[PDB]
Every structure is written in C-alpha cells, then in structure tokens.
Design a protein around this nucleic acid. Sequence first.
RNA 1: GAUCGCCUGCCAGUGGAAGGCUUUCUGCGUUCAGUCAAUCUACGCAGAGUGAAUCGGUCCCUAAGGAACCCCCGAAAGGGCUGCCGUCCGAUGGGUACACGAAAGUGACGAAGUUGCUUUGACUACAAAACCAUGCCUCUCUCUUGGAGCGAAUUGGAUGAUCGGGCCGAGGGCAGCGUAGCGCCUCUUCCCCUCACUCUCCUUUCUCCAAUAUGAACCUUGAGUCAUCAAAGGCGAGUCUGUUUAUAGUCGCGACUCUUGUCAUAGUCAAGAAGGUUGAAACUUCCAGGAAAAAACUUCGAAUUGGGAGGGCGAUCCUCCCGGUGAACUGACCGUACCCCAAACCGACACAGGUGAACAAGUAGAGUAUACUAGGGCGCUUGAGAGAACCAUGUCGAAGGAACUCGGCAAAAUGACCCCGUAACUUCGGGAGAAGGGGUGCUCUCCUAUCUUUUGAUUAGGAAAGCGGCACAUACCAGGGGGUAGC
Lengths: 82, 452
Amino acid sequence: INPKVPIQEAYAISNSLYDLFKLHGPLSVPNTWLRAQEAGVSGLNSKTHMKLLLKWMRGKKMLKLICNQVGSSKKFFHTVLP
Amino acid sequence: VKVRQQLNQFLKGTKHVFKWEVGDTIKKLRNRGLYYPALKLSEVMEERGMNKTVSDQAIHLDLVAKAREITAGENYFVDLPETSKTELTYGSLLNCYCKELLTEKAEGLLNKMKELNITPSSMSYNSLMTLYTKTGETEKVPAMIQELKAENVMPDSYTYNVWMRALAATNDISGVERVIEEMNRDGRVAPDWTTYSNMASIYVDAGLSQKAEKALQELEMKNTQRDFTAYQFLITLYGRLGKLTEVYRIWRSLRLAIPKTSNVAYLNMIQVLVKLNDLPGAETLFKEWQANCSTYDIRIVNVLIGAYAQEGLIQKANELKEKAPRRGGKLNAKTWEIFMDYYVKSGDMARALECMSKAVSIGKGDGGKWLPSPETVRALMSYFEQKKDVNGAENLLEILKNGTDNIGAEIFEPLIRTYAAAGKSHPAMRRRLKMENVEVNEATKKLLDEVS
RNA sequence: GAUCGCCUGCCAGUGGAAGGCUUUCUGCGUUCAGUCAAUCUACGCAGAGUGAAUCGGUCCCUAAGGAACCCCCGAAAGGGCUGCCGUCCGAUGGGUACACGAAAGUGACGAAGUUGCUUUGACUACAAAACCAUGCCUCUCUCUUGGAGCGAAUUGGAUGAUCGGGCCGAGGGCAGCGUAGCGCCUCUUCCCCUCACUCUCCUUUCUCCAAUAUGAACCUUGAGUCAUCAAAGGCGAGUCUGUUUAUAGUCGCGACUCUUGUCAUAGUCAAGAAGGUUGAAACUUCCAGGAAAAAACUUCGAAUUGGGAGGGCGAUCCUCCCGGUGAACUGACCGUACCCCAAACCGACACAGGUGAACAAGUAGAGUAUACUAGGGCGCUUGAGAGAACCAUGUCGAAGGAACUCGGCAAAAUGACCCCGUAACUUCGGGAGAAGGGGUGCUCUCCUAUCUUUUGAUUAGGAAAGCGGCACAUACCAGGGGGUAGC
C-alpha cells in the first residue's frame, strides 16, 4: 500500500503499536486509541492519524485486518499478524 | 560425483529457486571444493537469473579462476565492465594469484592498484604474504607490514599465523612469542584456535607450549563441540606430550560427535596410535571400525596393513589385504609400495621387482601417475647387481630401467652407473653403450671403456 | 542549449527491394535553386567516401515463355515445329565444398482446430536452535544415618511380650524442569606436519506496482570413465547361542541373518562433456484434386592412391582383394554510400496524388479498431498585427418538429457488452442484432474458480448491502427503425 506517514519515526511508532497489539489482543478495533492512550505514546496526534498509521503498518505487513462478523453486524479486527 | 547428477536433473526442473538457496549452494560446493558444479550452476542460473552483485561477480571470478582456468579467469576479468572492477574483483584476482604462484603479474597488478588508489584489504595482503611464504622470500613480509601500519589496516589472525610461519623459517621463536603477545597487546583480536595451532605447528620443534595446546583445545571446544580443525595440525603433537591420555581421551571426546565417525578421523588417529605403537589398541579399533563397515575402502586398511609390513608381519598384512577387496573397494598404489618396501628391506629380488612394477603400471596412479618417487632404486639395484649374482645385470637393465623409464630417464644418474658397474657381471653391452647416451659418469667411464 | 509540441500497425519509426546515380560526409562560397533578407542546404567549387568462403548477385537447374537445329509451309520477307533427343528464361527450388552414371526423391491445395505465439531473478547482513550448558530444584552412580511401626510365637486361643522384619530424617550428586546460548558434512589428500576465499537487506520508501536479462527444444554421431554379466559354482561378518576353558579367559558354532564381489577373459552400456539438426511444422475436414529439374541429397557403378597380399613363376610392373575415392590450406569476381510513403522514386514543381513485402515497447480495449504516451523521428522552409463584411470547416441553440424542398439531400439521432423478450411471411435455411425493454460506476463481504505467478491472497462472476454524481459502454470508439409497391 502507499499512504502518508513520517519517514523514520514511523518505524519506532510502528514497533510501539505492534508491542501494544501483541500484548493486548486482536480485539483492537478502532478506538484502539484508548489502548494506545493508556499504554500511551505521543507519536500520534488524532484518531485519523491513528488509522493512517494502522493502514501503513498493515501495508508493511505488521498488522492484518480480519473479519469476525456476528449476526448482521460488521466487526473487524486488527490482528497483530501471526 | 552424485552432486552432478542431482544438479543436472535439477536444471531441467521447476519451482524456481531463490538467490539465497543458490548462494548457499555455492558457498557449500566451494567449501567442499566442487568448483566444477558451483561454476556450472552460477552460469546457468545466471543465464536465467542474470543480475548478480559486484560481490557475486567476484565470487564467479574466483570460481572461473580456481577452476584451474587462470587464463580464462583473467580474460573474463578484462571482460567485466570497468564499472564492475572494484576492490572485490582485484582482491579475487589476488587471492587467485596466491595459489597461482604468479608473483610477477601479481606484484605488477598490485602496484598497478596502488597507483590506482584502490586499497587492498586484509585478505589481500594476507594472500600476498602466503605467496611470499611459499616463494621463499618469506622474510619480506614485515616491511610490507610496516607499510600496512602506515596504511591503517588491521592484520588479522591469519596475518599473525603467517607471521609465525615466516619467523619460523628464520628460527625466530622469540619472534613467535612476541607475535603471540602482540595478539593481546591490541584489542583487534579476538584470536581463534588457528592462532594456537599455528603456534603448535612450529612448537612441535621442542614441546614447551602444552598449556597453549590446551588453549587450542578450549577455544576449539567453544567454537564447536569438537570439529575437524583440531586433527590435521595435531597428529605429530598427538605423538607429543600427553601421548597416552591426552590422545586416548581426545579420541573418545571427539567420537562424542557420535557419527560412525569419519574415515578422516580414524586416519588422523590410527597412524598416531601406531606411532605410539599400541598395536592391540590399533587392532581393536580397526575391528570395531570394520564392524562399522562405513567406507573403509582403503583409508583404514592401508595404515595398519603398513604397520604389519613395517614390522615384518606380512602374513597378517597379506590376509587383510586380500580380504579387503572381497567385501569392498580398491587398494592404493602406495598400498602396493609399502608391500614392495617390506619385500625390498628383506631383499627378495624377483618378488619385490614384480610387486613394484605391477604397482607402477597399474591403474592406481596417484594424481594421474604412480612413478615411485623416492630413490628406492638405489636399493633396488644394490639388490639386483650387488646381490653378487651375475644376472643382476641383464634383468637389471631390462627390468629396473624398463620400470623406471615409463616416466622419464632423468633419475638415472644411479641407474646408468649402476649397469656400467653392474657389467662387472659380464660385458656384452658395448652394442648398448651408444644408446647409453644421455649423461654418464667419467670415473665409471673407465668401466665403460673397458667393454670397448 | 533550453521549455513546448506532433507522430508510434500506410502521410511521419527500423532493415531495405523497385527506382534514382553523388543527392552521403569533410572544408570553402552564396552567381544559380529554395515559393524569403539565406551566413543554410537535397545549391556552386574543392576533397573524401562503399572492404564480406557465409549477405545479395555470380553459378546449377527448370515454369510462363523467346528463340536454335532439323523438319513443314509460304511470291519475297517470313510463318509454323520443342523432342527428334540442344540454348536462353526467376517472382521458384540448390548455397559452401570433386566430376562421371543409374534406382529413391526434389514434390506441393483450401479451411479449421493444436504449436509460434518467450520467460527469470530480485536480498536468510550472514542462518537457524540441538548441544550441553546452566542454573536451577530434584535425588539417590551411592548411604547413612536412628526413628518407628510391624510382624514373630503359643499349642491347640485367650494369650505374652522381641528378632526376623522394617519407613521417614539428616547429608551426598545422581536419571526431572527450567535456565544462559549456541551452531552436527564427509578432505576417501593416502597423507595431514598452518591456512585466504571471507568479500551480500538486521537500517529503509522509490517491485509507493519497475529496471535488467533472455530468445527455441530433441535426435543423431564418436570417443574416454563406471556399472555391467560374460569372465567362474569360489566369502566373510554380525546375529543367535552350547557351555566354561579360567596362566585371564574366549572357546566353541549348531543354526539364522546380512550384505557383497575376484581370479583375468571381454561383453553391452548408463552417466557426464564435444558436433549437424527436427521445431521453421503436425493432425483432421473437405473437393475446384492442388509445378519441373541426373539439381543437391542417399545409396550402387567406377574410381586411383595406399596396402597387403598376388601363389607371384607370366616382366605380366600385371593379378584378387582390401582401403579410400574430396578430406587441410584455399574459397575469385560484381553489388555494398545515400532516400527508399518521399524534398532524392512515377507525377513538368522541394506538388495534400501513386509506390510489394519484412519489424512495431505500454496503458484501456477481443481488437493491428480507437484515444494517450516513451523510444525513435518531425515542428511541415513565409510571417507580424487587427479579430469587419464574405466563404470553408466545427460547438451550442428556446418553442416548434420535415411546416423546407423536386426528394428528410444534408444534418441529427441510434450504436457497445449482458439479460429479458421478438411479429407477418417462408423456398422452413431464414426473417432476426426482427420490432419492444431493462442492466452497466465504485466501496466491503461471501461464496464460487483458480491459482501456484510458494507462503493464501490476488483478478473475474454473481450474489447483497451501501456510497457519490443530473449523468456511471460517462471522453474515443460505436446499426435509425417500422409498414407497403416496381424492377
């Protein structure tokens, strides 16, 4: 993929988020912002920037979006990429 | 070798293989010496996967070269686009010249580079120094070492070890020790067991570095459980101090590797065990070995067969000899020669003759040849003519010379005098003494003139 | 030199045949040509330029054909005759190795499937986690240290009270986990004895959807190494086991199992490394039934230097048969520049005309259709202003819808793919894309297929939920249809 991201700090921040994920669990749906605010890091500034880094990571193959839909309700999970 | 069959059936295959697998296969076959298939691969999988690094270009250059194709090596080199002619290529040229013994072109190219302001690395300097240590001008290395110091290079463990082999040639054992201390003086080693085994390779002169040999052992036992790089530079020191326990212990601590351990291991140790002359231990070890039956072909029969033949134990040597091809492979030319060695030492004329000539003209040639190289002819004659028998002249020439002239008539400074003063049995060879032409002595030229 | 453009499956590119015949290049010049003022050139002067056993010709053959001879015929000329046993003729076949003289050939449509319709690599810095280390309690190669419960005995069961039996406690590394951490290919050298191959993503964007490299795939032929079975009915070696022999034990072996060739002999040959060479064509379907050549090639027929015999007794310098009989140097001549959809060819011209083939990167597209590009080539050898009538070629035009006019000429419109459905008539093949309608975007999910281009996802189809636009074959590309006469 090819979204925006700062150039090199991105690697540190991605390893930060990957740590967070593999500790916590693939439940980290958006509003993962809460998890990454409590195991907190200041290498983010906003929810939109958060999801942008999430996309960048999953492109680099550090994260993976997955499906778990229940009933007729769409839920989606960022696994920490086994 | 079956390597060729594996790769050759592979080439017409599928699941196109990664450059990593390929490079690893190179680094494997080069180590095991298989220049031929390593090159053939790095050619065909280049035809298919072309772009190779500049480093991989250097690797291919070394393969082409050390395919004993130095000519094609240099040609390919000047084929390389000058863009791909960096330090790595020049260094491969050098480290090829190391073996190639071409000091002249080597030094020319060396100064060429030096003017070109493209620095040579450690291994470059070091290949050079080994070329020195074989060219005999081994004393020439420390001046270039001073240049190296002026050129900001760290001469590695290998440089220290060829220093040891260079200051051994001039009997500077204090120089060996001061190199040994220069090791720890600078934090640039990080020395390995090559350091200590190169110490031993010269200190097998007296025997005053046994704790350093134990240090060899412990650095070894770090880098490995125990791997085969403690057993080629150690067999005579395996006859050195510790001859009972430090060797009967290392043998089993090595077998702690627990394969049906190699013919090479047994052939590094059995000649030492016969050096110590513990024949029952040698015999037990041989018998458990052929219980292992794991490719003894000659590498285990020849040695203690030779020990039997050396003693005079020829019935025991002979039974085993004519047993070994009942079950398995061949026997070596020098396996015939040790037998001839006993036959000679015991003087038996016709049988020693037969076995020798068989050995020389049978397909057991070592390196495409089995000229019996040592001057055993000087004894062979002293048993033909100097047995004080009159046909130690006729058969002397017609068989001794007929055996020793399948390779070249050069060695014949004993032989020609030998017949000239073997006749001396009966003079009927003035007809011969023209064809006796190349070079003959002047004192024995009187023996010659005597016939006519 | 630089921004900007135009072309990229017949006006602009690449190699060129036909044609041109110095138009190519180098210097000098601008009298002539150029649709200018020309320092410029396809212009004048001056000079140089084209290398080829293999290309293309030469050459061998023949087709269409034109003639030669003989023959036949005709006032003269000449016409007729190719068999009367010859010579010319390429847009065909034969190109590299002799010539001479016979059997095989050379050798043959169309259409349609099936081939040709190229694929690789792209970063284990450097390569993965058993060994035994280690950091641990656990535990008895082995004990050893006193305690404490637990049978022992009677004489014929209600007793009587102590050694053969015996069960947890303090110390010692051995048989159970976790704890740092870390590399297990073979030199079959015949001899090791000190050595160099060690030259890559752990740090990266830009495979953020590209840059660099490749261009056939299969028999058919000859000559050096193992493994053959032709070269013989010929063995050790560990398992499995009969008991004791003791210089101390290995002694013995009945019987079973397990691999495994030699003594030479040659006898066929499987597995790597060198040379021409099928692919460049195959198979089916048909009916209009699909070139020639002693030319080359493949054999014999003969061969004439090389051999060995020729019985050599014909001096016969010959006789019978075996051996090669085009093989190494060599490989002449002529074309070779330049343009070859054009300013150099045919068109009187530096003219929107005409001029066979061969090759042609990407995106979307079935498409060589069509847009837009890179590469390559070109900016059309008149321009600078103003932005009237007028004309050419185009975009839009309300309301109206053929009222125009000879005539809906032109212009407009419809168009694509998928699905729905489709009339009269009939020669029953067709009308038929009959007419008449709907759908077309993207997003995620699901399942389906499929796909080895590895890692499970990607691309297309079809389900069903959104989401935006007036509009989703959005630009380019792309049928107006129906009814009824005459011929």
